[PDB]
Design a binder for these strands. Structure first.
Ligand code: MG
Ligand code: MG
Ligand code: MG
Ligand code: MG
Ligand code: MG
Ligand code: MG
Ligand code: MG
Ligand code: MG
Ligand code: MG
Ligand code: MG
Ligand code: MG
Ligand code: MG
Ligand code: MG
Ligand code: MG
Ligand code: MG
Ligand code: MG
Ligand code: MG
Ligand code: MG
Ligand code: MG
Ligand code: MG
Ligand code: MG
Ligand code: MG
Ligand code: MG
Ligand code: MG
Ligand code: MG
Ligand code: MG
Ligand code: MG
Ligand code: MG
Ligand code: MG
Ligand code: MG
Ligand code: MG
Ligand code: MG
Ligand code: MG
Ligand code: MG
Ligand code: MG
Ligand code: MG
Ligand code: MG
Ligand code: MG
Ligand code: MG
Ligand code: MG
Ligand code: MG
Ligand code: MG
Ligand code: MG
Ligand code: MG
Ligand code: MG
Ligand code: MG
Ligand code: MG
Ligand code: MG
Ligand code: MG
Ligand code: MG
Ligand code: MG
Ligand code: MG
Ligand code: MG
Ligand code: MG
Ligand code: MG
Ligand code: MG
Ligand code: MG
Ligand code: MG
Ligand code: MG
Ligand code: MG
Ligand code: MG
Ligand code: MG
Ligand code: MG
Lengths: 147, 187, 105
RNA sequence: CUAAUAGGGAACGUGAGCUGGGUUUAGACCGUCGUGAGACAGGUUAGUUUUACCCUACUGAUGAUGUGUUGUUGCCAUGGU
RNA sequence: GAGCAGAAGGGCAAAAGCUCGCUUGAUCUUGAUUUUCAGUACGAAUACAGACCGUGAAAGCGGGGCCUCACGAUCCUUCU
RNA sequence: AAUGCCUCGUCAUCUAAUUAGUGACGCGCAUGAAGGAUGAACGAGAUUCCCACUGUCCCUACCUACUAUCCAGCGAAAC
RNA sequence: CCCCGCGGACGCUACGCCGCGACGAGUAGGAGGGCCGCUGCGGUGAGCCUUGAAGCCUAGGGCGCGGGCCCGGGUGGAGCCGCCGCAGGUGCAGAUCUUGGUGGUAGUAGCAAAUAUUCAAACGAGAACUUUGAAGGCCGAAGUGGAGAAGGGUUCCAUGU
RNA sequence: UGGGCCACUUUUGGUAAGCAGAACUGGCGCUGCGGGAUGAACCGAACGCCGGGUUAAGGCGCCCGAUGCCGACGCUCAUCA
RNA sequence: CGACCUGGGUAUAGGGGCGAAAGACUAAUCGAACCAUCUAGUAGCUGGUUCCCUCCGAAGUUUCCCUCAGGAUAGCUGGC
RNA sequence: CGGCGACGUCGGCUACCCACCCGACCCGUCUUGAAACACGGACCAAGGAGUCUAACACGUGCGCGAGUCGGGGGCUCGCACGAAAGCCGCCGUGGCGCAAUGAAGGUGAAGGCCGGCGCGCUCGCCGGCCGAGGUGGGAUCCCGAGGCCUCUCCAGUCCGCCGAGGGCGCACCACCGGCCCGUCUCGCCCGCCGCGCCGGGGAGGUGGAGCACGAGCGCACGUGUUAGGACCCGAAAGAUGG
RNA sequence: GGGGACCGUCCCCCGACCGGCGACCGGCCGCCGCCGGGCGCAUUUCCACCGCGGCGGUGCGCCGCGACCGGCUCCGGGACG
RNA sequence: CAUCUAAGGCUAAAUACCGGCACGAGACCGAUAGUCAACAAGUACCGUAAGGGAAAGUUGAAAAGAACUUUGAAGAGAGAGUUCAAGAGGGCGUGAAACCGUUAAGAGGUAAACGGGUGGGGUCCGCGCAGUCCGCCCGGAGGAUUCAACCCGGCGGCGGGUCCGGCCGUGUCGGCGGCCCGGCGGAUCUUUCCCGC
């Protein structure tokens, strides 16, 4: 809505909010990111450190599918299966542990943030972290690798 | 003439909700009367939070609510939040909670009710405790927002750990000069 | 000129973009035209499936998608050979055939 | 020569008053400087000087107000000198 | 009232000057701080901490010059 | 000297009187040889003088034509 | 246990109403409010209107701090407005602004290059200018004469206005 | 916005300047009002629309509000007061 | 009477022509014609920038910049 | 309490003209300073200048919420409206968020208390519990001795208010710890189909836009910055083809 | 692959106990009110008119006067310490 | 090790479309706008040429477009007539401002104009010109579907252990009742009865 804007309130004020001394001119200072090393250097250094220069090795023809490895933490591991899977295993008299295949749910790596409830579980994944495997074995579970 | 300054005369605060939600305005009418006609400071805090903007009323997760209600001496008390109660899927067991919230997520509401809990709106809370007795007034994390990572001292100053505004994150985006001693300086 | 904190923005509008702008006001008409052509084609092939030929089961290539299965271009010649279907009769009875796809497993 | 041939101001009075010798465009010559284009508070020659009918000022020319109309003869305020 | 390399100012006497003896702390490192300052950088400087050393009988002192000046980004190159 | 700052150079001549002209001199700021120096004829070229001639002037006057002026008709512009 | 009386003002669009206290300059600039204004769309006003819409004019009556608005009179002759939202090519004194129109100047400057006109008559409503006649003059054959090229294109010639 | 300027006082260059350059506070710029006849800055005082009272700085022959007080004490005569 | 004047027909075209030379002339245009387009070229520079009331209310200073008629930066401002 | 009232008077005036007293220089603009002998403006009418797109940032409103979003496609008499609306769910592909850090190879965020043991060696095998530590502040909330009452009292019946002190402490702030990735220094152990120039672990500093019980996503609006003709008008120029 | 069982939600029912008849509704009662029709037909009730009537409210068509009270203010007398 | 088989050829569909033919629509513009062009517009006109390029819509329902008389040489008038209207008369809907003529009123030697304060005059306005109104009471003289209380009927409002139903929320059991004789789901178990190794 153009009726809610400052231009309706600036009718009758000669400078339109841009001043009488400095006026509103075309491009004082340059166009775009002009002069980022000369007369806008303070702004670029203050808010964008690291902007200028090269760092690291360049790699031609990056295929992002090769490095596709979504990760899931331990605190969300039991959300990949139904609540019925969880409650049946908890009240199970035998030592049967459900299998959570994180690859089926769309994750490849199991990271170890958080804590697990105290009941065994078999976790299928492409990759595990050291602490994720340690906590899974702590609750009596097992880590099994898939490809 | 009087030697005074007028630049701080007008106090800047919400005197009413900027929202046009008529259900929020009705229970603002309710708690405006309660704050005026009682001596309870609980009603005054609740009323001023009803005026507040959404960023000033962050959501409260189930885990944080459970943790604050598990502190000693808070049993059988009503957890009141002026805002949304949100499910947390990182908690496995939900105790019996009595809660009053402006909004409750569908899944958080189902979990609370299965645990044997109780959910009240703010008009039911007024009937249940007009003076707000036996309540635990909680708030969500106010600074749990992405904007607060960018706030603070400028990223290009020493000892500042504030996130810069970058379109993309990678080894080519704002990592060379001013970020490592090998390229000019680090600070 | 930059002003306080901000993002270094690089718009790609230095190249007379206003002379090549694709508006989409014919999108609802294109959806109607496609829908009418689909209906007309289905009427043309009277009892035959409206979608087209049957496509094979195919695993998606990369490591991002090899857990997923979709429809391929056509049945390979080794598949038709052991199914007992001639590779020239297959297309006439609604079986799509892809002669350039092999079977690794 | 004369009594004397005092010094000055008025947008260094005065160019819709003139003139245009000088300076101060474009042509050209000489000396000096510069590799050169070119330059010279150096010299020299040739080089378009537009408009007033408006307002005021001023110069003159009719008139105007008041004595009822109209005419003759007059006075002198004031200004110049 | 001399000298301390140099401009000037400060400082300094069994010193910081002069002469000897032994040496390489003018080395390897991470942070913090001061100075200019926007409390950005560079340069310079201060106080530590961890190595490895020098010197001295030792306490200690020393990571350049008694202090205040003597210097230099991105990109590229070159060496380790 | 159309080339010399000092400079209105110095001397002579021209005049009553000449920063002008001509002749002469020359350590010449900074003349000079394919351009230097001469030399008739020529020139809407620059300069000085003399005779004659005159309203250029002393010192203005008068006359003629067309205007301006007034009238009938017509009728702008600058600003 | 009010009752010989059967009764008792207003209010509170709560985005409303009421009370008390202090305060009030403002360029550049920012913000808020606008029952200020223009145009169009969705709703709504059982809206207005040929018994007279819009527009315009008005020594008419008023309201508002103001932006502006309402009403009377006249002209006009066919459409228009209020409220809730929505959307803008949405408000002018300037820009040596653009286009159009109009003043003062001003009945002014001016209608002054190449010697020159006059008398009578006719036609005609009307004659300094037309026509005829009579004079006086000019071009003076390198013409103000008689013919062509280029260019023009019917200006040629009659008749009429 | 990133042209400032002015005044008391301190203060540098300059013979000086309504000059140029600093420090401090205030002002003008952005500010009207009473007074200084007049005036960006001085003196008083800062401002919604008004009635009454009283003042500031400044005044009270007449212009022009207010001494039209029987004001006090002296000083001073100027033919540029 | 000549290196004379002149008609018409031809030739030379824009960084080109033509010039007994003046940067002259090349259709009133010449130290680079005219026409259309790129093109609404760019402008730290000049001019303008349209209704009302209420509230708050500055700066001409710091640092850096081929910076000195401009910016970034801190300061001063307003709003939430 | 008085007077006065229809063809002459009564009241009114913002509005019309005129008179008088005081005040009063012409607006716009740049500017330290304009009435300026600074520029533009003879007059009137109509037109006339911060826009739209994209991208960010923050604020605000709305829906859902560890998710969110169908925008591309498809299905629905193909069509007045309707080019709308509705729906899809094995159309969520995908985007953004949910994980960071390193140039990369890669790695990748749980502790606290009570016990027996090697040696409770700065510590390794377990047990039991609990589930992001602690300090100082901290709205709110909870307890609360003691008071506040009636016509009066010996003696409790029910609850309301004030209340010194005490307690649990939201959000947030300061600080101290802890965890993850990079990089140093020191050091000793462990693993085994590959006994390796193999793999893992510890302590103490330090670098990170991190963790430490999520807050985001979509839509709308506002403001600011930017690229675009970019608030409007304005060069001297440059190029292409005639 | 089908068919089952189990679990989680649901949608209807067969019944009772619990809180309510509610802002989900009817029937009976009880109280109250209104309306219509009778009866009541006159010291009641109502209607309209008159008094230069009174008590209230508002307000005088225009122009004016006075009084006392209160607020603010400028003055003047008198007396006491 | 993987993957294809160059240096020959054809091929629809989905895609594009500011020219053309024919259509439909619009929160667009409304005659200085919208195309330059609403109209005899790429026209008139300009330039040697390449090229440049306008302005310009509206009587009335119907021409019923003013017969006739009269002055004038006519333009132009005065009468008359048509029309609802010519105060619509062929560039004719309305008809602003600037500017001009005339009439009326007022004024005028410090150029006008303006702010504040009054005064005078004028034009209008006021149903101005004996000045509001209405509640109760008192008195006077009059009228009347005539008042209270009762009866009949209708309709409401409020209350009632649920008086009676109908129910509503929360649980509560046989699940008789739903994988045949009720559904939808589940990353829960299974033929240990059944169609594919
Ligand atoms: Mg302003
Ligand atoms: Mg203006
Ligand atoms: Mg530079
Ligand atoms: Mg203020
Ligand atoms: Mg002079
Ligand atoms: Mg002249
Ligand atoms: Mg003159
Ligand atoms: Mg000359
Ligand atoms: Mg010359
Ligand atoms: Mg030479
Ligand atoms: Mg000549
Ligand atoms: Mg005299
Ligand atoms: Mg050391
Ligand atoms: Mg030292
Ligand atoms: Mg000479
Ligand atoms: Mg002479
Ligand atoms: Mg000589
Ligand atoms: Mg030679
Ligand atoms: Mg004030
Ligand atoms: Mg103000
Ligand atoms: Mg506009
Ligand atoms: Mg205008
Ligand atoms: Mg004349
Ligand atoms: Mg003449
Ligand atoms: Mg002759
Ligand atoms: Mg001839
Ligand atoms: Mg002829
Ligand atoms: Mg400036
Ligand atoms: Mg100064
Ligand atoms: Mg200024
Ligand atoms: Mg100020
Ligand atoms: Mg002031
Ligand atoms: Mg004054
Ligand atoms: Mg004075
Ligand atoms: Mg006063
Ligand atoms: Mg005075
Ligand atoms: Mg007086
Ligand atoms: Mg004296
Ligand atoms: Mg030349
Ligand atoms: Mg241009
Ligand atoms: Mg300027
Ligand atoms: Mg200006
Ligand atoms: Mg100036
Ligand atoms: Mg001005
Ligand atoms: Mg002046
Ligand atoms: Mg001038
Ligand atoms: Mg100017
Ligand atoms: Mg002008
Ligand atoms: Mg103009
Ligand atoms: Mg306009
Ligand atoms: Mg749709
Ligand atoms: Mg996916
Ligand atoms: Mg704490
Ligand atoms: Mg810490
Ligand atoms: Mg911003
Ligand atoms: Mg532009
Ligand atoms: Mg160039
Ligand atoms: Mg047009
Ligand atoms: Mg029109
Ligand atoms: Mg005529
Ligand atoms: Mg009419
Ligand atoms: Mg007309
Ligand atoms: Mg008139």
């Amino acid at each position: 809505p153009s009726r809610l804007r400052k231009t309706r309130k600036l009718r009758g004020h000669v400078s339109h909010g841009h001043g009488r001394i400095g006026k509103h001119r075309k491009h004082p200072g340059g166009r775009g990111n002009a002069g980022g090393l000369h007369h806008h250097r303070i702004n670029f250094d203050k808010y964008h450190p690291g902007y200028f220069g090269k760092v690291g090795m360049k790699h031609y023809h990056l295929k992002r599918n090769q490095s596709f490895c979504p990760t899931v933490n331990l605190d969300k591991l039991w959300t990949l299966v139904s609540e019925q899977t969880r409650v049946n295993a908890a009240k199970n008299k035998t030592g049967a542990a459900p299998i959570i295949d994180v690859v089926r749910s769309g994750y490849y790596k199991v990271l170890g943030k958080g804590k697990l409830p105290k009941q065994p579980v078999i976790v299928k994944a492409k990759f595990f972290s050291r602490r994720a495997e340690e906590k899974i074995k702590s609750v009596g579970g097992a880590c099994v690798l898939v490809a | 003439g009087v030697d005074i300054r007028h630049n701080k005369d007008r106090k800047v605060r919400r005197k009413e909700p900027k929202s046009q939600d008529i259900y929020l305005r009705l229970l603002v009418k309710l708690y405006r009367f309660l704050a005026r006609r009682t001596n309870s400071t609980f009603n005054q805090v609740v009323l001023k939070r009803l005026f507040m903007s959404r960023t000033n009323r962050p959501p409260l997760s189930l885990s944080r609510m459970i943790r604050k209600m598990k502190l000693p001496g808070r049993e059988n008390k009503t957890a009141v939040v002026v805002g949304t109660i949100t499910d947390d899927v990182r908690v496995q067991e939900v105790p019996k909670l009595k809660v009053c919230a402006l909004r409750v997520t569908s899944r958080a509401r189902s979990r609370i009710l299965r645990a044997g809990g109780k959910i009240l709106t703010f008009d039911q809370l007024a009937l249940d405790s007009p003076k707000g007795c036996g309540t635990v007034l909680l708030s969500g994390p106010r600074k749990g927002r992405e904007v607060y990572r960018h706030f603070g001292k400028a990223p290009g100053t020493p000892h500042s750990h504030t996130k810069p505004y970058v379109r993309s994150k990678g080894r080519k985006f704002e990592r060379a000069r001013g970020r490592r001693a090998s390229r000019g300086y680090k600070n | 000129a930059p002003s306080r904190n901000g993002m270094v923005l690089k718009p790609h509008f230095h190249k007379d973009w206003q002379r090549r702008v694709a508006t989409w006001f014919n999108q609802p008409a294109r959806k109607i035209r496609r829908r009418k052509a689909r209906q007309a084609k289905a009427r043309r092939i009277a009892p035959r499936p409206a979608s087209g030929p049957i496509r094979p089961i195919v695993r998606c290539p990369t490591v991002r998608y090899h857990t997923k299965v979709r429809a391929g271009r056509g049945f390979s010649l080794e598949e038709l050979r052991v199914a007992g279907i001639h590779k020239k009769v297959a297309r006439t009875i609604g079986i799509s055939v892809d002669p350039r796809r092999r079977n690794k497993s």
